[PDB]
Each structure stands twice: as structure tokens, then as C-alpha cells.
Amino acid sequence: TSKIALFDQTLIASLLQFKAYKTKVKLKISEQRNETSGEKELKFEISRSDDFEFLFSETLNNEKYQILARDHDLTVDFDAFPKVIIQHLLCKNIVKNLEEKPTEINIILDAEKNFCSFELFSKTPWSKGKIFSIKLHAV
Amino acid sequence: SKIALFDQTLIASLLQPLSLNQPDFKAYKTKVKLKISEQRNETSGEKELKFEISRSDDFEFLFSETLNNEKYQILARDHDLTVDFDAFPKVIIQHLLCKNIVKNLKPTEINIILDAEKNFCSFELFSKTPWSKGKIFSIKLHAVR
Incomplete structure (x- = not known):
């Protein structure tokens, strides 16, 4: 409940299995409250x-x-995490890619399709600049 | 055939222990001279990159x-570097060349951790991001003696 939409956009992601493919995916990031506990939750939806x-x-x-910030050395707290992610996705690189090969979003699919790994990157002159990778489960 | 690629005085945050037998490390902002040079190994002729702190x-x-x-290759592996050995110094140096137009008319970005016996020091370089510290790499430097 108390679901506030914070980001809803179609992005170009390169999909992986091991032949790569740049495809359009809808990413939705929303804020909600856990029904039993009332605690703040962050929901990621890919379609x-x-x-x-x-x-x-x-x-x-x-x-x-806390597991995600441990694995990716994030210094931003849970509250600011979606603000800096959405700022990166919407405000930082306003570069239009002509579509009738590098991507900042990588999606790695499971052969069984029980899940997928959603990866966000901000390239640097010395590294790929991985921000975080999140395991997304089949709905 | 040693060639100095970078030679500059930088502000670093230095951590040094009170003693070899005590947990306490004290922290200081201090000016350090960093020198990055390329050279050829005398026996093998292979390319080498030398880091010197003084x-x-x-x-x-x-x-x-x-x-x-x-x-x-070990360093690249430990820090997820994607640049090759030849490009590494050019990129790090290009990063360090900082025109601060902060003409006044304290985040450091360099951490140095010392040994109690002064046998080594860990040199760490950072480029802050909105979500992280942005560690570029850390290198263990050894005492010159």
C-alpha cells in the first residue's frame, strides 16, 4: 500500500543469456509501505x-x-538511494540514441526465467562504473 | 630510460599508528609529493610504471x-579496472590534473596509511560519485632502503 510512483520510463537495455541484444524495457521505481510493518519499501519492476x-x-x-550497499560499496542511505538513481537516469546524460554497442543498463536472464539480474552502470575512464546489480524475480 | 610523467605535491589524509603495539591511528592532512614515471626493466626490457611518494x-x-x-593485472582485477597497462598512467594522470578555479577572493581524494615499522604505506586514490566513495585503486608502496 501507499504506492508512490517515482520513475516510470522505457529504457534501452542490452539483454543477455550468450548472444547480446539491445531492447526497450519499461522500468518502474516506486515507494511503498509494507502492509504488516508499515516500514518503507522500494519496488523495482521491469517489463x-x-x-x-x-x-x-x-x-x-x-x-x-544493506546487502546491496555491502556488495556494491554504496555510501548513500536507503532513503537517498532512489533519489540519486532517478537523478542519474533522468538528469545526467540527456543523450538521444537513434533506433530504427555500449549500454548503461544490462539485463541477464535465467534459462528457467525464474529471475534476472538488473545492472546499472556509469562508465569512467578506468572502469565500467557499475552502480549496482539487483536480482529481479519473475512475477 | 626513466621518464617522469607526473611530479606534484598533493594533499593527502595520512593515518599513522601511535605505536606498533597499540590500536590507535591518528589522522592528519599533509602535503606529499607524488611522482609517476615510466621506465624499462634493465634485465627484461619490459615496460614498468613507478610510483614514488615522498x-x-x-x-x-x-x-x-x-x-x-x-x-x-592483479591490481586491475582487485579494482575492476578496464583500462590496459599502457593506458592506465595516462588516465590516472589526466584525472589528477586538476584545475581548481576555486579563486577564494575538506574532502581529500587521497588516503595514505602507514606502517608502524615504516616498511610500507597504502596509497589510495578516489573519485567521488553521488552514490559512492569512488575508489579508483590502492597500491602498497614499500620503503626505499
Whole structure:
């Protein structure tokens, strides 16, 4: 409940299995309250305007986030995490890519389709600049 | 055939222990001279990258490390570097060349951790991001003696 949409946009992501493919994916990031505990939650939803069976999501609470900031050396707290992610996605690189090969979003699919890994990057002159990778589960 | 690629005085945050037998490390902002040079190994002829840290405050303050391609591969692995050994110095140096137009008319970005016996010091370089400290790499430098 108390679901506030913070980001809802179609992005170009390169999909992986091991042949790569740049495809359009809908990413939704929203704020919600856990029904039993009332605690703040962050929900990530990935879907495709073509594949209807392509539905993945993950809900993060503060505990789940601590694992994510441990694995990716994030210094931002759970509250600021979506603000800096959404700022990166919407405000930072306003570069239009002509579509009738590098991507800042990588999606790695499971052969069984039980999940997928959603990866966000901010390239640097010396590294790929991985921000975080989140495991999204089949809906 | 040693060539100095970078030679500048930088502000670093220095951590040094009270003693070899005590937990306490005290922290200081201090000016250190960093020198990055390229050279050829005398026996093998292979390309080497040398890092040297010194400071006018203490003639006994002399640390260095020489990286060859193999040593670098370990460093690249530990810090997820995607640039090759040849490009590494050019990129790091281009990063360090900082025109601060902060014409006044304290985040450091360099951390140095010392040994109690002064046998080594860990040199760490950072480029802050909105979500992280942005560690570029850390290099263990050894006492020059």
C-alpha cells in the first residue's frame, strides 16, 4: 500500500543469456509501505512492451538494501538511494540514441526465467562504473 | 630510460599508528609529493610504471612501487579496472590534473596509511560519485632502503 510512483520510463537495455541484444524495457521505481510493518519499501519492476510473460520485480526494505550497499560499496542511505538513481537516469546524460554497442543498463536472464539480474552502470575512464546489480524475480 | 610523467605535491589524509603495539591511528592532512614515471626493466626490457611518494617534512619518508604488466593485472582485477597497462598512467594522470578555479577572493581524494615499522604505506586514490566513495585503486608502496 501507499504506492508512490517515482520513475516510470522505457529504457534501452542490452539483454543477455550468450548472444547480446539491445531492447526497450519499461522500468518502474516506486515507494511503498509494507502492509504488516508499515516500514518503507522500494519496488523495482521491469517489463517489456512486447513480451507479456516478461515481468520481473523486487521489493527492497532497509535490510535487503544493506546487502546491496555491502556488495556494491554504496555510501548513500536507503532513503537517498532512489533519489540519486532517478537523478542519474533522468538528469545526467540527456543523450538521444537513434533506433530504427555500449549500454548503461544490462539485463541477464535465467534459462528457467525464474529471475534476472538488473545492472546499472556509469562508465569512467578506468572502469565500467557499475552502480549496482539487483536480482529481479519473475512475477 | 626513466621518464617522469607526473611530479606534484598533493594533499593527502595520512593515518599513522601511535605505536606498533597499540590500536590507535591518528589522522592528519599533509602535503606529499607524488611522482609517476615510466621506465624499462634493465634485465627484461619490459615496460614498468613507478610510483614514488615522498615529503619535504621527512627525508626518511620514501616509498615506492614498480608495476609491470603482470603486477598490474592483479591490481586491475582487485579494482575492476578496464583500462590496459599502457593506458592506465595516462588516465590516472589526466584525472589528477586538476584545475581548481576555486579563486577564494575538506574532502581529500587521497588516503595514505602507514606502517608502524615504516616498511610500507597504502596509497589510495578516489573519485567521488553521488552514490559512492569512488575508489579508483590502492597500491602498497614499500620503503626505499
